[PDB]
Design a protein around this ligand. Structure first.
Ligand SMILES: NC(=O)[C@@H](N)Cc1ccccc1
Length: 83
């Protein structure tokens, strides 16, 4: 069976809180409330699981979300890691 991969949101000190939130809404189809909570989870504990899915999908979403921050001049980082 294909291995599943966690998409992780990593904290940083520069990306605006609300920007992270709308990234989460747009790329991972979260509500505002859910988005804030995941954002805040990473904010407090250094990181947060966003979603767990098939590798290629996990990689694609992590990059899409990362690029949004990157092209905005933010160090916002979404990574993948196996479970
Ligand atoms: N602007 C700030 O104070 C960031 N801690 C907000 C943030 C949350 C989650 C990930 C990255 C950034």
């Amino acid at each position: 069976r294909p291995k599943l991969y966690k998409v992780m949101l990593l904290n940083d000190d520069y990306t605006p809180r609300e920007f992270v939130t709308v990234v989460l809404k747009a790329v991972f189809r979260m509500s505002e409330d859910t988005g804030r909570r995941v954002m805040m989870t990473a904010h407090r504990f250094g990181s947060a699981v966003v979603v767990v899915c098939e590798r290629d999908i996990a990689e694609t979403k992590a990059k899409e979300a990362t690029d949004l921050g990157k092209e905005a001049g933010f160090p916002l980082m979404f990574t993948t890691e196996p479970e």
